[PDB]
């Protein structure tokens, strides 16, 4: 009569703690402590299956930031402090040899700082970026002084991005969404179930999505709500645009010590002549895709429309500008040189700006600063996706406009996390039988 | 899972696949992760192997017990039920009724088996 | 505990429920609490559960051994002691030979079920 | 024969960590970390069931003790140090609208703070309470300066107490005396079985007990050993007395920047006039009370007693004043005004000390300043209980003396947890049997 | 681990021992280690329970399945292999059929006990 | 047919956590968070049984090493920082009474502190050891202050070594070698089973092991390998040598308040004469055992071989002198009286050095300051082995050189859990039979 199963697919929508997995050096992301991954992941596709994913009310994502902030904390903790630099700096300009730009960007600034024996004082000097420094009425500070301690990273800790794979506790489960054209919310039609993600790198950025899995056919357009001036669209490209940043100049660094095994590492003197730091985007490929973006936002607003690309309008340098990481450095990238023209029916050059001062997160407290690196940086990244805001105003007729608008690093998980859903199993149910 | 989709019926020839893998078997960030989802994965499975203790199974995947099906119960033939329907299917109608098939699953077997046989 | 102060009799017939809430089922203050508590739960539930495992039971709150109950263990009539008394009273007096019975109820049983139905 | 059941009612006494629930902003309890509450927490009465308890034995409140001054800690530990302000102090009296009493009590000073930029020193002022500082020889210092470092607290940090709740991990239970004239110790027939506890909120004070829960019918004596002059009597009443604190001045606060986004509360400057902060206690009803309270020490005493009431003989201020806290303010009041008069057969005011750097927890180190509130302070307060102490000397005759005593937070715990023991349950067990 | 270099025909009469102290049953240093102790303690006995549990025994200690000896696993003697060797000795030729071992003898018992008795 | 069994005898290599148990004041081992041990360790013989240990392979060491550090800078981080201390120091030698060879060693030197204050300075003094300072061109300062941060240990914390036992989790076990000849590795016939080790007490020496246990009955030689100079000689004594160790000196410390509540512990003057604070070692006992250790490395070399001993050749203290610690107090005494003479076929005494900042287990960064001890030290400690290594250059003829060589405290370590190993068990498995 009532019999009782337990094996039984029955899941349902759960939330629970996920945790790292890795292919298992010391980087910033400790991905060491995440175990190793399985060398065989094979998911189990579930035949007659239909599932609801919604990639905007997905809280994996609240995971992965929680995880990232919590972890970056925790890898700056037990560094070497800067309080000591917040003296007064007597600054002046780099002139040895200004190629142009580079005109007022490089400070060569002296103070009188703290000795391993606290009655004695040292005269030194180091470069600073324009954008590290505030002028006090030639008298400066550095920037964010005022607002929060800065710490130095150590500088044997990477930031290159390494794939983590986030795992469910045995009785849970992931789905995975196979709908290859799934717009980030509502059913999904063909899912299987995994117990491990595929690894995600966790690369930010604002503006331009670097490093992340491509479309399967078409270029994506996803947005929690389209006609929505207040959401972003997410836009997942299924090419990747190669994109080459560089920072020619030769650099050095000093070591300076402070105190008692504390020591700062200033930028040196720079050898051979300064550069702009720019980065180049193949220009083919870019605009190229740009169309096929294009193609695709037309089918919602109409296939008689008129789609114009605009810059970023103003803000913060982390939304109005590409701001990025290679090998530790910190770039902001001029993306007006990208986001230009209209659609009715050689390289790129970037100019960037060079800046040591972070607040990561868009926190208003705590600031680290990023050591110099001496050798000469060099990164190619794979563009593979944008963060774009539909404008405002009357938005009237057929036009309308697009600005690659960002912040909150949320969106570039989540861009990755949209396939991915969690599920408990509930491993018991009856059903009427005859015994 | 790999039921799947398959029917009730169907579905019932493959429990050992998924029970087998229900349990499967420092500090900082993830350390203190992974320390909760081994905590986690027990406390779910022995909070699921009691009740199977207690409504007299315990050598479970498959098991019978002295409750009759209630006609309020998605009282559908058992050519659907047990043939052309998924458990989650089920699921979705029958769950309406966990509570009161619980506590009958548990007592109407404990209050019979036990005491009578006791007494013998 | 609502069987409270019936007797041991009466106690029988809601062992169920007693039983029902015996498992239930970051860091900082209260966290670790929390941590600690839930990992106790479990490892006493199960301290208990291998015992009944090993005093061949499994299938509990009610069983019976092939150990004979001696006449030192507190030998008072059965009308007293299984009708008109609590099991509280009755662990202050029983309680002097645990040791002694539970030796007894693991190998008296285990070495003659088991062995004896590997010949058989 | 011999057989065996397993759910069987048998308990004993035991000692395990019990863990918070409450009803779930950011207060130093950090009353959210604790899990909500059982909506219906239904006790299971214990028909026919004798209990014994014990509340001097009962390590129920040293739990509570140590989770309280555990957690004060960690709620205090990511804020501004004040070490900075260890430093000669020039002072001055407040002299613009002094109300008589409040004559030296308000002191104008002076100092060489520190600064953002640490080469340059700022001149501030800020005022203090005269028990706050120390004359050397009109320079001063911070009290306790000389003992250990000042911690401010984070101004964002509620003090005000919430009801928490002990709960028992499966396995375990509470049991709750149901005996309405239970003396603390020995038989309590009528005892109920509960996996909670009630909220008991966390009020901190020395010499009246405030806001806690009333005796059922008759005022309760209870003590370890009545006897002994060394020992504490607790007095729960039957009724509350409604006491009205306030302090009247009204605040302004400064913020002063010591350092990269380390800042100080200033106590500003008042506007208005000068007033004692005192606290007004409904007159008839604490005498009339009182009355209560002797009527009941007499029958341990004999009833032709004396009773005679005496203000606390000396000490720190803990011990010889009304402590307690409104809003974040921390109160010393004079109490000699309600502990007078003798038993053979309106209202009344007392004066009141404010006092910012407080070593709570009767800790030699470790000191806590509060931060200024500008609004004015009223808080009213349910007196819902004593601590007494027997005087000593010859106590001859028929005549005795009671005190305000106090100190040792223990004691405050101890009035709210005399109802409840941590028993473990012990579901196995044999009997004899013919099957 | 009494049974130590006895033969495995000898080391049955004793496996109640040893499996009785299989379970037994803040954070700085030690701390730490105790709580990670105390949880591995009950991973690792639970991931066997479910195991004797799919291998349809619970009533452990020693069982018997359906499933027929092969005579690629080490097919010698019985009056060598449980009577004149140890289990340590026996382990290390046994060994290398354990997946295939355990694969049948989830499946055999399940698949010809489960369903046939769902019939009857 | 198939039958499985759950309790069978079957283990294998394994490797877990173990954890600390103790006979359960407030040392640096924090040996109260251990737990009780077990008053009937019983072991289990194991019959029949044989079993493989390498002592040089074996993680037990490993954990060891790892909890000591661990739990060293856990019991030294709630304390006292030493920064201020380094500041320009002005020193003049101690020459009230010098005892002709201590003329250089201690010095009278004073400086301008930070006081409660901050913004006054006080004038004081202090003795230092010659070991402890570096002069900069009579100027000095501290030791390592130019490589990492002072701490001063707390006063409270006591250095005396306590017993700790290993033990097993459940699921696991320890199995003790019982062959009383074994040599740390290969087959070891005759084995039991343990949940714990014996308790051994975390000694830290260099060169001479002390209070360790003996070997049963031969003086013990073991290696990795005898023949390769890279890999030291460990040699268990089969009994125990005299060491008396002594500092004369009759002390007095000063307590200097720097701050509020941080004051540090200074070496005050010296009452009485001055002295070397020399060790003395039991002569005949000490090369007769020699001559025991002799007839043993024999064996590995010819019994026509010359062995010959000689003193360190060269590096720091910790490698080149007998590194130990009596009451809290760093003696490393000159043990070139010890290693000397050949083999072919009273009182000696060591004079010391005192050494108040250690820098622990070789690492670079994290100095601890060891307080002044007032009363008049004296220790009696067991020498129970030797840390050698063989010498180098041609190696020819029959003549061979031992010096008393060290560093890393592992080996220390391995020289007690050289008997256990870790195992799991798993009780589960099957046989043929017929049923
Ligand atoms: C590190 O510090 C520790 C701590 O101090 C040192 O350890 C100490 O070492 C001391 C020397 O070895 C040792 O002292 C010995 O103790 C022995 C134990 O006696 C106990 O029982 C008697 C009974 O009444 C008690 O009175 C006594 O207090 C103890 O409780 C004594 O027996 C030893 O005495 C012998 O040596 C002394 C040395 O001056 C002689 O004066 C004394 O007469 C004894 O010597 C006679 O016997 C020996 C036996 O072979 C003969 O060889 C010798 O020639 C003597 O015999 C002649 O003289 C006697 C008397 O005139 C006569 O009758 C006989 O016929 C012969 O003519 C001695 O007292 C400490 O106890 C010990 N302390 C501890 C705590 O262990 C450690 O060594 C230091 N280490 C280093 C490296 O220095
Ligand atoms: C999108 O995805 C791409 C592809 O994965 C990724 O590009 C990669 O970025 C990383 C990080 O910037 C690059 O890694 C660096 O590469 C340089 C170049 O080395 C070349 O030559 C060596 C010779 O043996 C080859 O082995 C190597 O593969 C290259 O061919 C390395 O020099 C860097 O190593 C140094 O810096 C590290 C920073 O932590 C140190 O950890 C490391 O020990 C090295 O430091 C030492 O040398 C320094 C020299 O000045 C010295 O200063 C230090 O003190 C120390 O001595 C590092 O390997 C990687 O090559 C890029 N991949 C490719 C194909 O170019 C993009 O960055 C990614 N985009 C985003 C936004 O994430
Ligand atoms: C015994 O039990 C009694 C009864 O529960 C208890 O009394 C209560 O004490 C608390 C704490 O002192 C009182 O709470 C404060 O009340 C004032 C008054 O607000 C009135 O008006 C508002 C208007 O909407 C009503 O909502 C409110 O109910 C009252 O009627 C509030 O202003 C206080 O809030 C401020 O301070 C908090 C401190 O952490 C902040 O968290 C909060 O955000 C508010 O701060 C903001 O405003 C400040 C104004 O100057 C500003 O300075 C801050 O920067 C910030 O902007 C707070 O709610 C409570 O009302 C008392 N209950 C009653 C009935 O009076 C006793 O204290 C207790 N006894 C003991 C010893 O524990
Ligand atoms: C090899 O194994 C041996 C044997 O176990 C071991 O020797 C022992 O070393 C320890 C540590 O140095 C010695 O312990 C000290 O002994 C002195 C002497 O006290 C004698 O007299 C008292 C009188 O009642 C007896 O009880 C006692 O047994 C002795 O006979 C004690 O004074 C020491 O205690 C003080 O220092 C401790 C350090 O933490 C404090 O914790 C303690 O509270 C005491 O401090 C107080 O007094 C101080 C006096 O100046 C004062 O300065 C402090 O502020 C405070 O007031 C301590 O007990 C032990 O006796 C040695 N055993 C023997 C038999 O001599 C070897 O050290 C070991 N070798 C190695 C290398 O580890
Ligand atoms: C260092 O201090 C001296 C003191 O007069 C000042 O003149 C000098 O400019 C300071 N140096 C710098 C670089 O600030
Ligand atoms: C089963 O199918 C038959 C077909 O006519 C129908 O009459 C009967 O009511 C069905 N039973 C249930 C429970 O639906
Ligand atoms: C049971 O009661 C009868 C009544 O006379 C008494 O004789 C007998 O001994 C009792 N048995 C026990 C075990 O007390
Ligand atoms: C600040 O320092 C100057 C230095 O002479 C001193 O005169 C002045 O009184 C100090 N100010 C205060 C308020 O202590
Ligand atoms: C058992 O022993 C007999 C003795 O001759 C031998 O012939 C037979 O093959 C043996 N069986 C096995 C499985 O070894
Ligand atoms: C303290 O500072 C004064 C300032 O001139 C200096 O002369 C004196 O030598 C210092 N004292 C010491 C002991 O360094």
């Known amino acids: 009569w ?160 390494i794939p983590i794979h986030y795992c469910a506790p045995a009785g849970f489960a992931i789905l995975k969404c196979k709908d290859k054209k799934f717009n980030g919310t509502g059913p999904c039609p063909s899912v299987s179930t995994v117990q491990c993600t595929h690894g995600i790198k966790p690369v930010v950025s604002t503006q331009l999505l670097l490093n992340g899995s491509l479309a399967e056919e078409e270029v994506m357009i996803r947005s929690e709500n389209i006609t929505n001036n207040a959401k972003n669209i997410l836009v997942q490209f299924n090419t990747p645009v190669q994109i080459n940043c560089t920072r020619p100049n030769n650099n050095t660094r000093k070591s300076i010590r402070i105190g008692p095994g504390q020591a700062f590492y200033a930028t040196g003197d720079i050898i051979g002549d300064i550069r702009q730091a720019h980065c180049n985007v193949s220009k083919a490929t870019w605009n190229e895709t740009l169309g096929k973006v294009v193609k695709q936002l037309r089918k919602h607003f109409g296939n008689n429309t008129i789609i114009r690309f605009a810059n970023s309008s103003g803000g913060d340098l982390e939304v109005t500008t590409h701001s990025f990481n290679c090998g530790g450095e910190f770039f902001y990238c001029n993306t007006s040189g990208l986001f230009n023209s209209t659609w009715i029916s050689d390289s790129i050059t970037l100019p960037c700006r060079i800046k040591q001062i972070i607040n990561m997160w868009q926190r208003i407290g705590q600031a680290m600063y990023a050591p110099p690196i001496q050798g000469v940086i060099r990164c190619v990244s794979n563009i593979t996706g944008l963060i774009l805001t539909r404008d405002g105003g009357s938005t009237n007729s057929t036009t309308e406009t697009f600005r690659p608008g960002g912040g909150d690093m949320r969106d570039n998980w989540r861009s990755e996390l949209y396939k991915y859903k969690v599920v408990k199993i509930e491993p018991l149910g009856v059903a009427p039988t005859r015994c | 899972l790999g039921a799947a989709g398959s029917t009730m019926g169907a579905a019932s020839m ?65 050519s659907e039920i047990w043939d052309n329907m998924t458990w989650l299917q089920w699921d979705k109608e029958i769950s309406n009724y966990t509570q009161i098939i619980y506590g009958l699953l548990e007592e109407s077997q404990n209050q019979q088996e036990k005491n009578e046989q006791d007494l013998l």
Chains 1, 4, 6 share one sequence.
């Not at chain 1, 580079?102 to 040292?122: A, V, W």
């Not at chain 2, 905590?39 to 498959?62: F, N, T």
């Open chain 1, 2 to 161: 009532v019999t009782v199963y337990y094996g039984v697919p029955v899941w349902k929508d759960a939330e629970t703690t996920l945790f790292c997995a890795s292919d298992a050096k010391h980087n910033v992301w400790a991905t060491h402590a995440c175990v190793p991954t399985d060398p065989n992941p094979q998911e189990i596709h579930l035949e007659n299956v239909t599932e609801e994913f919604n990639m905007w009310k997905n809280n994996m994502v609240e995971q992965m930031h929680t995880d990232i902030i919590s972890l970056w904390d925790q890898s700056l903790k037990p560094c070497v402090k800067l309080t000591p630099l917040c003296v007064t700096l007597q600054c002046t300009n780099v002139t040895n040899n200004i190629t142009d730009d580079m005109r007022g960007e490089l400070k060569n600034c002296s103070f009188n700082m703290t000795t391993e024996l606290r009655d004695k004082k040292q005269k030194v000097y180091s470069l600073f970026y324009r954008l590290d420094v505030v002028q006090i009425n030639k008298e400066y500070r550095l920037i964010n002084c005022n607002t929060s301690a800065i710490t130095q990273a150590c500088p044997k800790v990477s930031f290159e991005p």
């Open chain 2, 14 to 78: 493959t429990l050992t696949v998924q029970a087998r893998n229900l349990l499967s078997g420092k500090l900082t960030v993830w350390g203190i992760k992974q320390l909760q989802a081994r905590v986690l994965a027990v406390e779910r499975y022995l909070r699921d192997q009691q009740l199977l203790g207690i409504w007299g199974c315990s050598g479970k995947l498959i098991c019978c017990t002295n409750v009759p099906w209630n006609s309020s119960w998605s009282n559908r033939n058992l």
